[PDB]
Design a protein around this nucleic acid. Structure first.
Ligand SMILES: [Mg+2]
Ligand SMILES: [Mg+2]
Ligand SMILES: [Mg+2]
Ligand SMILES: [Mg+2]
Ligand SMILES: [Mg+2]
Ligand SMILES: [Mg+2]
Ligand SMILES: [Mg+2]
Ligand SMILES: [Mg+2]
Ligand SMILES: [Mg+2]
Ligand SMILES: [Mg+2]
Ligand SMILES: [Mg+2]
Ligand SMILES: [Mg+2]
Ligand SMILES: [Mg+2]
Ligand SMILES: [Mg+2]
Ligand SMILES: [Mg+2]
Ligand SMILES: [Mg+2]
Ligand SMILES: [Mg+2]
Ligand SMILES: [Mg+2]
Ligand SMILES: [Mg+2]
Ligand SMILES: [Mg+2]
Ligand SMILES: [Mg+2]
Ligand SMILES: [Mg+2]
Ligand SMILES: [Mg+2]
Ligand SMILES: [Mg+2]
Ligand SMILES: [Mg+2]
Ligand SMILES: [Mg+2]
Ligand SMILES: [Mg+2]
Ligand SMILES: [Mg+2]
Ligand SMILES: [Mg+2]
Ligand SMILES: [Mg+2]
Ligand SMILES: [Mg+2]
Ligand SMILES: [Mg+2]
Ligand SMILES: [Mg+2]
Ligand SMILES: [Mg+2]
Ligand SMILES: [Mg+2]
Ligand SMILES: [Mg+2]
Ligand SMILES: [Mg+2]
Ligand SMILES: [Mg+2]
Ligand SMILES: [Mg+2]
Ligand SMILES: [Mg+2]
Ligand SMILES: [Mg+2]
Ligand SMILES: [Mg+2]
Ligand SMILES: [Mg+2]
Ligand SMILES: [Mg+2]
Lengths: 97, 14, 122, 41, 179, 46, 149, 206, 26, 87
RNA sequence: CUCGCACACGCUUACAUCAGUAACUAAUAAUAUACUGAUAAUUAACAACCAAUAAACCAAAACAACACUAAAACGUUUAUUAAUUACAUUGUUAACCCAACACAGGAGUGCACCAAGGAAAGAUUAAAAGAAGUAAAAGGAACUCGGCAAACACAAACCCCGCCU
RNA sequence: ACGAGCUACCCAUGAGCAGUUUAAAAGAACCAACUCAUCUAUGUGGCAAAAUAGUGAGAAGACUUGUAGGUAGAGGUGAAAA
RNA sequence: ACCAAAGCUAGCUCAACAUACUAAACAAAUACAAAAAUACACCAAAAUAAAAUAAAACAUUCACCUAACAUUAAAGUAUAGGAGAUAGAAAUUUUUAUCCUGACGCUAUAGAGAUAGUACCGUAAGGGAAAGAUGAAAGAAUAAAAUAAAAGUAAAAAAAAGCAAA
């Protein structure tokens, strides 16, 4: 519980930088653009999460189905173990059943 | 049964 | 237990284990159990005469150095064989069949100190 | 997003300020002070 | 001639002993072959003397007077060796064309790695050597997994090093706002 | 009677049981060496 | 030479000749009592009795009669800050016994100079005088003596 | 002799293999990393031996000659301008010789001064038409020569005496190389008259 | 290292209080 | 020290032997004959660059052998350190 | 008071000299073979590496004369080839090895029982209880499951079970 | 996968048993070195994760012991104590 | 007042792109008992995955379980199942080139085990850590400034009676 004895430097963050000014600018690209591109294409990140949502088990299954063949050995083994554990916990464990 | 628990030494760096 | 990080040498073994320290052998074992040493196998240090040699291990500091130009095969050919072959071609006596007179050697097994097999230590 | 507690000093002090007149380790140790303070109240 | 391991008697107790600069590769190239052959021993005697002086200074618990002479002699020896080696390399490339003076082969040992296996001198061919025949240059069907693990570890190390460099450049950029 | 001194050192036995040649003479020892190299051990064998 | 591949010998092999040797030798003062005709060298690990004999007979022209070599083992006991052993390198020590009866004694390579000793004594005396003059006056009791009045 | 330093290191004007540095930080410690502005070899304009002016500090606006530069932390030092007083002579009962040592200055607090008008200026590197890469000023528009500084060994080439173990310039520059296609071994053998008749046998390499 | 300013500023208040308790001002 | 001759210490049975056991009626002797080995040849010493040591080898051989022989004779007759020899 | 010398296996410098110990190691000091720094060391004759191919060869080692059963390791000669020419390479310290330790433990062989190794007690008082030793009036197993332990004795017998080593 | 460097049993190569009674080197007898561990007392975080002291059995044999090797777990080995 | 406490850094994690994938060093020696220059050979080999679990037992069965075909639907459908637990397609459909790549991930009990597979524990396979904080300058150590805040002690041992408090 020993708290620091000196005030930290004040983080001088600007709310009018390039990212904070351009954030979410093209979210209505379809609505205002004679529909040609969904807001899905604007999602930047992993290949298996570009415009998708799910729980941990579904995410793991989807990741294994798309990029499972390009994974490393240890991460693939960990993914298989995690898939098995999530399956068992979600189907055989719980209170509401 | 003859149950015997051997002692566990501590590392020498301590 | 025993140590593994220390190197395995002849001191840390039994009497039957006696490993050399890296020196080269100088012979073989004869008839009566003795070691027979061959004078051809020992290195003969060819030392020059340093009496009339007027050169010192150090150089004059005021002497200038030179721009680093490492020797290469093309430069060596230009200094050694290019003038001779050029003169022979100008005179019309150049023979593509026989190039031994310009310093080229067809095979290496003939001469004493060979290059690719590296028969000389140094 | 790792979230840790920073005001734990004040959380402990809010309980320890009512046990400063106690006898023994109850006035210093927090584990022994919460029970003593609750019984005091 | 056992005095050549020592310097002149008038220069034993001197605190500072000065000398010239080291030999340069161009100055070595300018000389002939016999000159280099003699200079090799000329510098070797000086190196032996300097090593003896350093050992005696260590024995007497005194600092060696101007120890840079040893490093200058070592640099001169290295330069002479480099010049002789470059002459030998150029001449062997001209005659035979082989880059390396010792024969070798790119082999694949039992560990899956690629090794520059040099060749040794033997009086008998390769198919009659007891010690050499029991050697293996190939990978078994249980080695590709470990090869993939090695590729894996090197890729992960390189990726984390790249991320480290990226974060360093970032932190420097936002630490120095001179742009 | 008294135990704990089961390790009687012997260089010949050590080199014949856990030596490099003993490791490499069998594929299982080769796999052991592969695992040690993958882990990054400073000493693969005795 | 060391770290150099040697040509394999067979019946009819020409004489092995080394033109630029890679061996380096130190001359060390023996730590124990040694006779007059013995001279103590430190040689590289890849040096043999015959190699040393030829070295001293050709490079330095020393009539050596006997050569006796041994390998001294460097201590591997000292530990680093990481608790890692620091091993001093092993080294080969050789003793050569001269032939023609020459008597060798290791010379004093660091003779002290009388002028240097006198200068050091004068400097020590000057330092002592400076310390004496900078020492406080006991009758003052710690008062700074810089101020006049 | 190149002493290897740990990646986490702090530079304190001391030689990396010096007793003072070993006392300052033992080999078992490593401190916090200080931010260093990325300046390549091609963008370092402050050399040793030139007159530069101090911008910030108690002694500001003063000009001095650069003596030492430390590229690891981008430090430039001038002789006796930004100073703090340190004692060197310390014994049990005597102190003395309070010498004024010199504090470090960053590249931000020092800019080069051209020798013509003695005013500080911004130095940008350019490439001249003669193939020479020299500093020019932007405030005035002049060039600044390279401040030739005496080396650390302390021996000048103008006054030098050749000893018994030193060669002359004639012997150093004397070229005797005859570039032919013969090895050093054959050269020495034929020079000394060594005769070898037998030849090596067949040796297998594998 | 705990990321926060409220705890640091509150501890600065407490430090000022302790200073006041230790050395009372005239 | 004698170790620089070189000589090396060893531990084994220390016997005093004349050529026969003490029960032999011939407790005295007349002459010894010692044949030099191939290791101590004149040509071998010359190749080892040793010319003055040719006589030294003979001297050392005689001094060791004859002294050991006479000491065995004396200690078979009954003389030792505290019973020093009379004739 | 008497487990000492050396060799084999094993540990690697812990060995030697100088200097220091405020602290780090000795389960405490003195100081130092066990901590720190520097410098030196173990020199081969002892030991490791040190011919193959065919043929003559049943007849034990135990003082081996000659025998027993359990039938027994340990060798020369002949003939064909065995580079032939100094000086090769390696182990040479130690108070030490395996037991978490500077552990009353476990350790092969050749010599002697001291001519070599060491110290049971840090200094006091001499309470109870505890461990070890010595001695004891009269009794002599009456104690105890049992004569367990001890004892100036160290003997003769009867049964059960397993032939016996 | 790794383990017979401890232990169970083998396989090669070696080494030990002094004195005494006995026609005996007799799977005899007394008692040493040596090998086991019957009984008791201390010890019970001890000297010791099995010890010390006293006292015991074998002590020319189915005896101990040095070095090297082999038998590896659904197994090995075992004069059976699972 | 001791013991102590606080820094912001080393660095890690998740992705995307990407050349196309066993890093550098390889002078000498390295599968003789590895780092030992050198002699007439033998070299080599393959034969299903199992079970812990679920079916509340357990025998048939039990996805994923170190074999590429990805996404939107068909569809959790037809079917396979002690027809129980559970398993589960396909025919047929959709998928527009490049940059816009950094972080509502951590800050030394967190983040890789890592300052490091090193010490150390193991005969071996194997297991496997803790350890950093002054400053522009310590070539400013008669060295300077901020807390003197946990538990444990001292300043300052205790005076009939009691879950120690009200
Ligand atoms: Mg170990
Ligand atoms: Mg050995
Ligand atoms: Mg030995
Ligand atoms: Mg010889
Ligand atoms: Mg153990
Ligand atoms: Mg030797
Ligand atoms: Mg040890
Ligand atoms: Mg002490
Ligand atoms: Mg010491
Ligand atoms: Mg000895
Ligand atoms: Mg006492
Ligand atoms: Mg009592
Ligand atoms: Mg009593
Ligand atoms: Mg009694
Ligand atoms: Mg009585
Ligand atoms: Mg009764
Ligand atoms: Mg009764
Ligand atoms: Mg009794
Ligand atoms: Mg009785
Ligand atoms: Mg009786
Ligand atoms: Mg009955
Ligand atoms: Mg019976
Ligand atoms: Mg009977
Ligand atoms: Mg075995
Ligand atoms: Mg065994
Ligand atoms: Mg007997
Ligand atoms: Mg009997
Ligand atoms: Mg007993
Ligand atoms: Mg008793
Ligand atoms: Mg008996
Ligand atoms: Mg009996
Ligand atoms: Mg079963
Ligand atoms: Mg069984
Ligand atoms: Mg039974
Ligand atoms: Mg039973
Ligand atoms: Mg079930
Ligand atoms: Mg259940
Ligand atoms: Mg069940
Ligand atoms: Mg299954
Ligand atoms: Mg059916
Ligand atoms: Mg059912
Ligand atoms: Mg960590
Ligand atoms: Mg407190
Ligand atoms: Mg009350």
């Amino acid at each position: 519980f020993h708290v620091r004895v000196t005030l930290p430097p004040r983080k001088v963050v600007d709310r009018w930088n390039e990212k904070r000014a351009m954030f979410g600018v093209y979210d209505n690209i379809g609505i205002l653009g004679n529909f040609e591109k969904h807001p899905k294409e604007l999602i930047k990140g992993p290949i298996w999460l570009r415009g998708w949502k799910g729980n941990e088990l579904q995410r793991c299954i989807r990741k294994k189905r798309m990029v499972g063949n390009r994974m490393f050995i240890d991460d693939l083994h960990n993914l298989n173990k995690r898939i098995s554990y999530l399956y068992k916990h979600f189907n055989r464990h719980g209170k509401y059943r | 049964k003859k149950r015997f628990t051997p002692p566990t030494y501590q590392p020498k760096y301590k | 237990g025993a140590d593994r990080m220390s190197k395995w040498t002849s001191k840390r073994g039994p009497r039957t284990f006696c490993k050399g320290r890296g020196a080269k052998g100088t012979g073989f074992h004869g008839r009566d159990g003795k070691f027979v040493q061959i004078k051809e196998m020992i290195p003969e240090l060819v030392v020059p005469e340093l009496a009339g040699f007027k050169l010192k291990p150090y150089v004059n500091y005021r002497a200038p150095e030179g721009t680093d130009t490492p020797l290469t095969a093309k430069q060596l050919f230009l200094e050694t064989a290019a003038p001779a072959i050029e003169k022979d071609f100008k005179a019309g006596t150049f023979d593509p069949e026989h190039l031994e007179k310009y310093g080229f050697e067809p095979t290496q097994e003939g001469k004493l100190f060979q290059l690719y097999p590296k028969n000389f230590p140094r | 997003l790792r979230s840790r507690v920073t005001d734990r000093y004040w959380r402990v002090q809010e309980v320890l300020k009512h046990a400063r007149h106690f006898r023994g380790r109850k006035n210093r140790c927090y584990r022994l002070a919460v029970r003593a303070v609750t019984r005091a109240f | 001639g056992l005095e050549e391991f020592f310097d002149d008697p008038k220069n034993w107790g001197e605190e500072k002993v000065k000398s010239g600069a080291s030999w340069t590769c161009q100055q070595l190239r300018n000389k002939s072959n016999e000159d280099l052959h003699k200079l090799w021993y000329v510098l070797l005697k000086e190196r032996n003397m300097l090593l003896t002086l350093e050992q005696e200074a260590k024995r007497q618990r005194l600092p060696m007077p101007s120890p840079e002479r040893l490093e200058k002699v070592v640099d001169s020896m290295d330069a002479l060796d480099k010049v002789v080696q470059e002459r030998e390399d150029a001449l062997r490339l001209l005659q035979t064309g082989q880059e390396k003076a010792r024969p070798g082969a790119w082999r694949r040992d039992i560990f899956g790695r690629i090794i520059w296996h040099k060749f040794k001198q033997w009086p008998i061919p390769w198919y009659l050597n007891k010690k050499y025949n029991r050697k293996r240059f190939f990978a078994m069907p249980y080695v590709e997994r470990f090869v993939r693990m090695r590729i894996e570890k090197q890729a992960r190390i390189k990726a984390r090093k790249r991320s480290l460099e990226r974060k360093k450049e970032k932190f420097l950029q936002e630490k120095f706002p001179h742009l | 009677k008294a135990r704990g001194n089961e390790y009687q050192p012997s260089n010949i036995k050590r080199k014949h049981k856990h030596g490099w040649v003993r490791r490499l003479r069998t594929p299982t020892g080769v796999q052991v060496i592969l695992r040690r190299m993958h882990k990054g051990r400073k000493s693969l064998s005795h | 030479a060391r770290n150099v591949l040697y040509p394999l010998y067979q019946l009819g092999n020409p004489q092995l000749r080394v033109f630029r040797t890679n061996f380096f030798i130190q001359l060390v003062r023996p730590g124990t009592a040694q006779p007059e005709d013995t001279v103590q060298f430190r040689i590289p690990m890849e040096m043999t009795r015959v190699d040393l004999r030829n070295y001293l007979e050709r490079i330095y022209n020393v009539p050596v009669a006997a050569v006796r070599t041994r390998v001294q083992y460097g201590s591997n006991r000292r530990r680093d800050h990481r608790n890692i052993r620091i091993k001093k390198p092993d080294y080969k020590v050789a003793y050569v016994q001269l032939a023609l009866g020459q008597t060798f004694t290791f010379p004093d390579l660091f003779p002290e100079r009388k002028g240097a000793s006198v200068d050091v004594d004068v400097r020590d005396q000057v330092l002592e005088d400076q310390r004496q003059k900078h020492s406080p006056d006991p009758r003052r009791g710690g008062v700074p003596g810089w101020f006049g009045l | 002799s190149k002493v290897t330093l740990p990646p986490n290191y702090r530079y304190g004007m001391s030689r990396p293999g010096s007793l003072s540095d070993k006392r300052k930080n033992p080999p078992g410690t490593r401190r916090r990393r200080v931010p260093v502005e990325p300046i390549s070899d091609e963008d370092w304009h402050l050399f040793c031996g030139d007159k530069v002016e101090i911008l910030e500090g108690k002694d500001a606006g003063k000009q001095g000659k650069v003596v030492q530069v430390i590229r690891q932390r981008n430090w430039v030092v001038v002789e006796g301008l930004n100073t703090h007083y340190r004692y060197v002579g310390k014994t049990v009962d005597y102190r003395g010789t309070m010498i004024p040592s010199e504090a470090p200055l960053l590249h931000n607090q020092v800019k080069l001064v051209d020798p013509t008008d003695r005013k500080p200026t911004d130095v940008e590197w350019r490439f001249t038409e003669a193939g020479e890469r020299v500093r020019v000023s932007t405030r005035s528009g002049r060039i600044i020569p390279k401040p030739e500084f005496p080396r650390a060994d302390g021996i000048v080439p103008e006054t030098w005496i050749d000893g018994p173990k030193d060669t002359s310039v004639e012997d150093a520059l004397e070229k005797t190389y005859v570039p032919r296609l013969k090895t050093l071994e054959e050269e020495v053998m034929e020079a000394m008259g060594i005769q070898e008749t037998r030849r090596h046998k067949k040796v297998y390499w594998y | 290292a705990k990321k926060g300013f409220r705890a640091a500023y509150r501890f600065q208040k407490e430090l000022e209080r302790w200073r006041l308790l230790r050395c009372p001002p005239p | 020290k004698p170790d620089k001759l070189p000589l090396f210490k060893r531990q084994y049975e220390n016997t005093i032997f004349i050529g026969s056991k003490t029960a032999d009626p011939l407790c005295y002797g007349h002459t010894q004959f010692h044949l030099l080995p191939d290791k101590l040849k004149r040509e071998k010493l010359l190749k080892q660059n040793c010319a003055d040591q040719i006589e030294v080898v003979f001297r050392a051989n005689a001094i060791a052998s004859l002294f050991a022989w006479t000491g065995a004779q004396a200690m078979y007759q009954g003389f030792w350190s505290e019973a020093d020899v009379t004739r």
